[PDB]
Amino acid sequence: DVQALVVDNGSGNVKAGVAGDDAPRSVFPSIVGRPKNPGIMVGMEEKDAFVGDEAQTKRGILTLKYPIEHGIVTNWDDMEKIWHHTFYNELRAAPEEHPVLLTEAPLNPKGNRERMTQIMFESFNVPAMYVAIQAVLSLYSSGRTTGIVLDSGDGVSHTVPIYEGYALPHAIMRLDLAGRDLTEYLMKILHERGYGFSTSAEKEIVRDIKEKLCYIALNFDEEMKTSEQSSDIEKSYELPDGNIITVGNERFRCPEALFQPSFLGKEAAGIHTTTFNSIKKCDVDIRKDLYGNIVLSGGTTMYEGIGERLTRDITTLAPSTMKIKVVAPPERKYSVWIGGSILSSLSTFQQMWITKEEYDESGPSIVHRKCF
Amino acid sequence: DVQALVVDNGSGNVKAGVAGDDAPRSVFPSIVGRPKNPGIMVGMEEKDAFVGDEAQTKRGILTLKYPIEHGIVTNWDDMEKIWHHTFYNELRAAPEEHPVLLTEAPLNPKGNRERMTQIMFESFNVPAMYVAIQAVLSLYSSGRTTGIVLDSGDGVSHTVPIYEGYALPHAIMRLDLAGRDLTEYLMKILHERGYGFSTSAEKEIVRDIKEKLCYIALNFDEEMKTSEQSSDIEKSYELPDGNIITVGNERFRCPEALFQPSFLGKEAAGIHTTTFNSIKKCDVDIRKDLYGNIVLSGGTTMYEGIGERLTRDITTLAPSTMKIKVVAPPERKYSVWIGGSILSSLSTFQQMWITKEEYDESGPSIVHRKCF
Amino acid sequence: DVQALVVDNGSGNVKAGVAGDDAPRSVFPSIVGRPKNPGIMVGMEEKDAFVGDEAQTKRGILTLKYPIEHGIVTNWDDMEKIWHHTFYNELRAAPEEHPVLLTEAPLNPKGNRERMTQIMFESFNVPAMYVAIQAVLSLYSSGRTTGIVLDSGDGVSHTVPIYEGYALPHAIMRLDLAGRDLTEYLMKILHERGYGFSTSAEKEIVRDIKEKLCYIALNFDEEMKTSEQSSDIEKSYELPDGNIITVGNERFRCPEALFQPSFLGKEAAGIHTTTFNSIKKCDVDIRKDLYGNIVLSGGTTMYEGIGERLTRDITTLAPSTMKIKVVAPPERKYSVWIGGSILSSLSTFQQMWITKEEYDESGPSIVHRKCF
Amino acid sequence: DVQALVVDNGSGNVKAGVAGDDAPRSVFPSIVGRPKNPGIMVGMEEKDAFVGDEAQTKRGILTLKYPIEHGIVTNWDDMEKIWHHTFYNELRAAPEEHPVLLTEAPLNPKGNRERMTQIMFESFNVPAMYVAIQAVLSLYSSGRTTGIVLDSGDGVSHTVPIYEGYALPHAIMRLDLAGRDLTEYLMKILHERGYGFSTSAEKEIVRDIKEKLCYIALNFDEEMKTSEQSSDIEKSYELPDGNIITVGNERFRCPEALFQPSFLGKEAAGIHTTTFNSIKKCDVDIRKDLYGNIVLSGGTTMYEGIGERLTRDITTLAPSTMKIKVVAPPERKYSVWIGGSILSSLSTFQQMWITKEEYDESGPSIVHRKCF
Amino acid sequence: DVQALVVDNGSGNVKAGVAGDDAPRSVFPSIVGRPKNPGIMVGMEEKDAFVGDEAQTKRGILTLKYPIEHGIVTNWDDMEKIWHHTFYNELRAAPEEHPVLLTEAPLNPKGNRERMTQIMFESFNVPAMYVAIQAVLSLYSSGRTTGIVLDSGDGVSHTVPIYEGYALPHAIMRLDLAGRDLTEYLMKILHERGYGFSTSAEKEIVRDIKEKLCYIALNFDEEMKTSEQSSDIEKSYELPDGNIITVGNERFRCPEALFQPSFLGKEAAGIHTTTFNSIKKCDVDIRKDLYGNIVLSGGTTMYEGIGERLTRDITTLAPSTMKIKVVAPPERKYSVWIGGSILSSLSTFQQMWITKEEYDESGPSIVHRKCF
């Protein structure tokens, strides 16, 4: 039949493509930029707002804003611009002719889903629609039916355990601590070396510093003493204007906040304790199979050395006779989109779409009893 | 001739096979499981209910229920599922071509037999049928014609005396105290060490703890005083998730309730007093031969040290010049099935089958005239 | 003789006072708080831990922890702080010159009693001591000698039937589901309207929302269909910082989990089914008098409309000719303490105390011989 | 006793004195002037550099430079001259006999504070030393233990919330926009009337014009229309050589950049939004007491009409039931020095000084361990 | 439609022409001359004032005055004479039939623009008018949309950065040091060789000496030693009356005041430091494109060797990995006029003219609304 469009709306990036492929076609940041200075050259291309990668190339004269925060849309006018840009400029496919599969985080407010369905049916005029959960799609991509998925992107961290294809909804955990908080913490602790970043366009520089120079230590208190002894911890970075900076402790002190959220001033547990508590809220007869298939998903799980640290911590938390195995596949930054592409092409799935007739009959509230 | 199918329906397990063998082919628990969570992975096998060993393998997501309680069927819709599973999946033999031999406990209501015969003739379309008493089949298996059989399984304890092939029906006794009450009592007294079991799937763990660590003391008070002296009474057990527990007095305090039913809050005599009272309701000229052949059968008689305790107690109750002998054969957990297999293959038994013609002529009430 | 001190140690609150009064003098929460930030103003009070009502007043800079969970002490060092605070700051009475009466839930582990007795004799140097069951003190307060008490506080729900002063210990039931689970369930389902509570200090706000806006419906399904029709179900609440929230279905969906524990993901029966099963494990001659004196006790029974719902459900379960009567007295939140005050002042009770001489002679194990 | 010396080093002025007084003795500008012309009269007193008030009296033949910019020292050789002038010419007290208390802004680089400690111990040979935060001293002076202090001087604007004596370090915010930027902006917008200021001495003249004629409007957009109607907005000013200038809109357009930083071309939020965002990063249970005590401190908060404007803006941002109270006391240009004088005289403080022995033992890095 | 008249009013010269050409038609000095002696020959022409090139031919009997100084008009009666001469004698085109495009320096007083618009609408009766910035027209002429323009003529030096067609107004810098100051400095230092010029007509001779014999050194301190070693530096010049003078160091000491304004007794930075500071006030993401398109404009940039010196100095100031490229076009003395001619002929520009109707409606203050 006709192929579907798979759109993964994250807090940081937008992953989009066509169902049946092995990778998404379009990946661009979810930002909307507006000029802060006046234009004076007659004959230029005057535009009110810039979207996506165009806002990244000319961020020097723009103010940057994210419409999504912690998985929740906070500005629907900019979200609609981003979706228009995705449909007509990046994929170049009419949404009136394809069914659209969307994603969302668990334990979200219901108005988010309802507004999403309403916009998709009344603004873009799609034939069919569906909203899935991101970690479930990650497990679809993994190829298994039993495991606990740890998903961490830019806004939300969450764990979802599943056994033999059955959901354990009372065991779902959610943590509002992700890559954006780590970028802000790094920007804050860079002030100790004498480096100041304040604006929106310098936050994009700090994020690249983080993605290029940060790693996870196997034991924090020992690295805090081994690095203080020599200078082989220090690395250099060249700014867009030719200046050079050097970073030391900040390379591993920044992602340590995933395991000790009190560096940020948050009364919350790390990701290892959250995964352990999510496993312990399941029945005693299924914990043995969850300990062996801990699955990593998202961009924030791509630090160097995260699997060994997680294995060591959960091994310390768990009994001595269990076998803990964390699986960190390559290309796990796109596993949600890959799982959604796999799901939307099954022959048994073609009866779960929300169609235009059911929407005209019942309104936007049907998403609560058809998509879960 | 055409061989028969022998089906021993217990409260706890099903024993099935073909007449002429020395052991039953299929032994599985008599449970029906139903999922309590929603299934979310598209492409899975969506079953409504699980039966037998499959319900035991995935009990972590299921609610377990027994259709038989105290030898009486309390849910016929699930009993029909269990019988279908027994005929078509375990034995893989058409019941339309073999006569079926069923079992039952003595002193049961008549509606049980009538519903059983009606289902066997109208749902499975058997050619012939028969319902026997379990303790009599146990003596068929023993190879003797004189003795008193003490049968104890999961729901019912009963004694039946027989003298040279003749029934003594006024001396049959029945006790509603068996392995399931002992499992519940162990689960109740485990709270003293700080262990809490509540669900249907944890009861199956408590039952295995009981079958692996419990034993019968020769003298209860001296054992209670001796165990308090040292720690050589304590054993260890590993839970399905790697945790370790330790049990002490509970090892012999749990099956002591077979002899002192007041631990459970019941006004009833132990099994030794019941066997004695059953012997004493016989004629004075027969008691000498019953004292010398006391036969044990069933799963609840498999405790270590039960024969010596029973011999000691009955010797104390009986006159000094009688010779008490308890016989506990190995494989006494299948002696009912073995005796039924023996009975269904005798050449003189082939005229006692209830035929389809007699059923169509008189209805399901013929079970009271052709069986006893 | 000298008066006694009555201390009711619950999971949520401490009730303390002197024997002979009609109400306890000190009621404060059972919490220990520790600062999570550094103190910088020189000249301030440097306290390491805050107990009781002082931890509630400054919960903004503290992490709150409960030392008791499900009626079982999990941190004895904090329990010792709470008892010190109770004896020296609230009542201001020397425990060296008063006998102390403590309480406990039924079916607890034995170490919980032994450690309590050891602390009371070795740390506070009391002359005498006693440990009683709470649901029995509730009936002492009721003034009767026959009835079944349903006690429900913050940690444990339990029922105890008693007939003319005689215990029926084989019919005691226990359910690990109380007000704290309902607070957590309300906090979980508030996410649907867009409200996020995560820390220990926000849990204390959710608990107050529950105690101010929740009620029990007579029929759940008709209420779910009726509330969806209009907006007269919605109520407003003002947060400590001036924000306003509004709640709908959550008002009666939260306490419905007392009757349908599957909302929480638990395989267990409601309180009505548990009371019925507790009455049915008694003798047929005593059930008629238990159906007529169902007594309510505890904080979780203070919901508006619980007596009528319980009467309706137990009427549906019981035979048609029985007269079911639920008695819900005012001031039933202090009935355990009132019953203890009554018991400790009887002249016949003055020989049941555990004295210092017996403890020095036999150790902490005497609590299993002199108490029950 | 031996009293301490309290030295408040700002970007604009030096405040110095002796601990125990109610006002600082010496207040002079933090400038170092050098002659730009040759000296020709034989017999004059030749000097290489002029410091403090002498550089202001003869600024006609000098080039003026500030060694401190945005709270960070950019030229240590001139900082040493200023400290020598402060110790030997203004206070006339040997630093070898008194302990010295210094100040600093929050979120500064560490090398700044380390150089301060090193110079104070190796150049001036002090017995003891300490470095505090300015906004905390302002609250010491205010006499409270709860509030948020908005400090604004010549280089840095910062807010620090404090509750019941406890620091909330994750909610500290820093803004690089203060009086010097306002002086430069007024100098830039005076070109519209035809007045041109370029040099350092003319910059001092412009700063004096700003301190004498500028004020804050309650509503900017209405003030821009009311002033365009008449000429009652215009004031006159006499230059050092007898010329007369007149200023209009610039009286309230210049300090409006504190609330709209885009007049300067900065992507940053005003002081009202910064105070609000600093309050909102605290816990919900603490905000009510911070709204009620907002403390102003520094020279840049001395504009007429700042309290009413700040109250109106924060009222607009906050919920309608909160009570916002801004407190702006007289002498708030010296409140940092007064708070430091109070702190350095407490008896409980005499164990927090960094001593010469600890410095010889550990080096300059002990300031990160003993100070915060 | 009708073509426009482009008039570039500099401090030194007037550039005029018609829109659509590649070079201006009329270039004459902006001078007004009045006779200082009596005319005695009867029959001569009795003029009261001479304008333009005629005042240059007979400067021997005239006093010469400039009406414009540092970009500001200081005598409007002579300005009207110069404009009348430009319109009726040089171009010979009626201003009543053509729209007029004027130019101005940035950061000028507003009365200048207002008086220009008033005179153009009330004295010459133009249909439309517009006032542009000179440095922006230079970039219009260069053909780019990104760069920083260094414009230096006779009165003012200024730098304007532009990125992708957007203005950066907070980074505009202005320096009151240009060719006229260099002429006065050369006239002053020529006194060392024995040459004395005092009058206006001799200042016009010193300007020609400067334009014919001055050049910029690559390194000043080394030229001051290399030239001291020989006479190859000496050049000769013939005065209007036949005398011969010779110049040495003055050839490169005179234009060295552009890079060291302290030769003139001025507290200001050179042009290289001013350009660097104007680049550093832009955002870090833009500086890379401004370093590579530094554009020169005006007559004071026509010295031999200025591009290499500017490149060397900016390279020394900038980081080592940036690529600095100064572009010095031939015919850069008319690039402002060429850019204005290009601008006034675009089809999109024909709606930005200030027309007679808007002026009659709003007065001369509309120049602040329609021109930026």
Ligand SMILES: C/C1=C\[C@H](C)C[C@H](C)OC(=O)C[C@H](c2ccc(O)cc2)NC(=O)[C@@H](Cc2c(Br)[nH]c3ccccc23)N(C)C(=O)[C@H](C)NC(=O)[C@@H](C)C1
């Ligand atoms: C990091 C960057 C450039 C850098 C200048 C690149 C170079 C290579 O680093 C230095 O030169 C280190 C030096 C420094 C100064 C003192 C010291 O003991 C150690 C280092 N730091 C400085 O000059 C500080 C002073 C400062 C201002 Br004002 N407010 C701040 C707020 C917090 C912290 C410090 C400050 N400074 C000018 C900045 O941060 C500026 C605003 N930052 C940028 O433009 C960003 C976009 C790129």
Ligand SMILES: Nc1ncnc2c1ncn2[C@@H]1O[C@H](COP(=O)(O)OP(=O)(O)O)[C@@H](O)[C@H]1O
């Ligand atoms: N190599 C890397 N190492 C560490 N973090 C990374 C890396 N690459 C991306 N990230 C972080 O991952 C986040 C984006 O992950 P993604 O899963 O695409 O976000 P979302 O799905 O929420 O849009 C960014 O905040 C970025 O900082």
Ligand SMILES: Nc1ncnc2c1ncn2[C@@H]1O[C@H](COP(=O)(O)OP(=O)(O)O)[C@@H](O)[C@H]1O
């Ligand atoms: N080794 C053992 N020791 C003690 N009890 C056992 C043992 N094996 C099984 N049982 C008990 O015997 C019961 C099953 O006995 P069985 O004869 O199968 O009963 P039924 O015929 O009613 O199914 C179970 O309740 C189990 O607890």
Ligand SMILES: Nc1ncnc2c1ncn2[C@@H]1O[C@H](COP(=O)(O)OP(=O)(O)O)[C@@H](O)[C@H]1O
């Ligand atoms: N008015 C009320 N309505 C409903 N629940 C209440 C009310 N008051 C208190 N509760 C609940 O009762 C619990 C405390 O009950 P209580 O029996 O005093 O505690 P404890 O378990 O310590 O004895 C708390 O969890 C609280 O949520």
Ligand SMILES: Nc1ncnc2c1ncn2[C@@H]1O[C@H](COP(=O)(O)OP(=O)(O)O)[C@@H](O)[C@H]1O
């Ligand atoms: N009356 C006033 N009104 C407005 N601003 C003032 C006034 N007096 C001083 N200022 C400004 O305060 C600044 C110095 O304040 P202060 O806080 O003492 O400086 P520092 O940053 O050195 O502590 C100067 O920039 C000055 O412009």
Ligand SMILES: Nc1ncnc2c1ncn2[C@@H]1O[C@H](COP(=O)(O)OP(=O)(O)O)[C@@H](O)[C@H]1O
């Ligand atoms: N070849 C040259 N070399 C150096 N300076 C020159 C040269 N030609 C003209 N100038 C200087 O340029 C100035 C006039 O330049 P111009 O840009 O036309 O002035 P404006 O635009 O201000 O009218 C005069 O002061 C003159 O000294």
Ligand SMILES: [Mg+2]
């Ligand atoms: Mg994602």
Ligand SMILES: [Mg+2]
């Ligand atoms: Mg059996």
Ligand SMILES: [Mg+2]
């Ligand atoms: Mg209680």
Ligand SMILES: [Mg+2]
């Ligand atoms: Mg200050």
Ligand SMILES: [Mg+2]
């Ligand atoms: Mg010019």
